């Protein structure tokens, strides 16, 4: 049913929009409701790149600290990570460094990572500049993206770039 299968994990503080990000990408759907993820969830999505069928096993992790042990247990085997924060939430941005270290502690075999500042549609409520996001991504050695699960801005682009760097690894 596939030529390659890439395991991808979406991590970051609770409420940054990780589930919404996946919901938009996999089902082209979005819900304004906040239904916190219990531990970890996943969605499989088959994409077609260079005439090849790549199965994307996407794990949607819970952001709350109490689920750290449950979620980090899935880091090994992950080939790509979407480290997400909310442009309207400073605390979620300040947590990026620690999320980055978490990836280093539990990930294996040079997993690829993209830093994503979600909810970019909330321009009037923005608290973290794109400049700061880009600057942190650079220092962490990650490529940067700002996106919107709500307005469907850069969700596909984010996932496709991740698939590219994983494939070209
Ligand atoms: N305006 C806007 N709201 C968004 C966006 N993405 C997600 N949200 C909203 O932010 C809230 C939390 O989103 P959710 O996807 O549940 O976040 P999460 O990071 O998965 N949470 P947890 O880690 O607690 O499971 C929801 O109310 C959702 O509608 C976005 O791009 N724009
Ligand atoms: Mg969630």
Nearest CA to ligand 1 atom 14: 17
| Residue 37 is labelled as binding a ligand | yes
Tell which residue, 85, 58, 62, 86, has the closest CA to residue 72.
62
Strands 40-49, 112-118: pairing kind? unpaired
Distance 39 CA to ligand 1 centre (A): 16
Nearest CA to ligand 1 atom 26: 34
Q: In a mutational test of the pocket of ligand 1, which residue from 9, 14, 17 has the highest number of ligand atoms less than 8 Å from its CB?
A: 17
Query: What does the domain layout of the chain look like in residue ranges?
Result: 1-169
Residue range 1-169 in CATH 3.40.50.300: yes
Q: Is residue 93 packed enough to be buried (19+ CB in 10 Å), middle (13-18) or exposed (0-12)?
A: buried
- Does residue 161 sit in helix, strand or coil? helix
Nearest CA to ligand 1 atom 21: 15
Nearest CA to ligand 1 atom 12: 15
Cα–Cα separations (whole angstroms), residue 77 to 58, 59, 73, 100: 12, 11, 10, 17
Ligand that lies nearest to the alpha carbon of residue 124, given by its number in the listed order = 1
- Does residue 2 sit in helix, strand or coil? coil
Whether 8 and 165 have beta carbons less than 8 Å apart is answered as: no
Expt. technique: X-ray
- List CB contacts of 49: < 8 A, sequence separation 6 or more: 160, 163, 167
Q: Which helix (H) or strand (E) holds 118?
A: strand 112-118
- Buried/exposed code over 110-146 (b: 16+ C-beta within 10 A; e: otherwise): ebbbbbbbbbbbbeeebebeeeebbebbeebebbbbb
Angle (CA) 154 55 18, round 5°: 40
Tell which residue, 84, 86, 87, has the closest CA to residue 130.
87
Cα–Cα distance for residue pair 4/86, rounded to 1 Å: 31
Whether 101 and 76 have beta carbons less than 8 Å apart is answered as: no
CB atoms under 10 Å from CB of 75, counted, come to 21
| Residue 60 is labelled as binding a ligand | yes
| Residue 92 is labelled as binding a ligand | no
Longest dimension (CA), the chain: 44
Give the experimental resolution in Å. 2.0
Find the DSSP H helices in the chain.
Answer: 18-27, 68-72, 90-94, 96-106, 130-140, 155-167
């Amino acid at each position: 049913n596939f030529d390659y299968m890439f395991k991808i994990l979406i991590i970051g503080n609770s409420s940054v929009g990780k589930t919404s990000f996946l919901f938009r990408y996999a089902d082209d759907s979005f819900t304004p409701a906040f239904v916190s993820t219990v531990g970890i969830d996943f969605k499989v999505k088959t994409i077609y790149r260079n005439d090849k069928r790549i199965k994307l096993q996407i794990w949607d992790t819970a952001g709350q600290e109490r689920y750290r042990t449950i979620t980090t247990a899935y880091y090994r085997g992950a080939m790509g990570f979407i480290l997400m924060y909310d442009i309207t939430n400073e605390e979620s941005f300040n947590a990026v460094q620690d999320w980055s270290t978490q990836i280093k502690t539990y990930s294996w075999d040079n997993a690829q990572v993209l830093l994503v500042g979600n909810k970019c549609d909330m321009e009037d409520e923005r608290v973290v500049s794109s400049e700061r996001g880009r600057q942190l991504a650079d220092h962490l050695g990650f490529e940067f993206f700002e996106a919107s699960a709500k307005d469907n801005i850069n969700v596909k682009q984010t996932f496709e770039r991740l698939v590219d760097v994983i494939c070209e690894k």
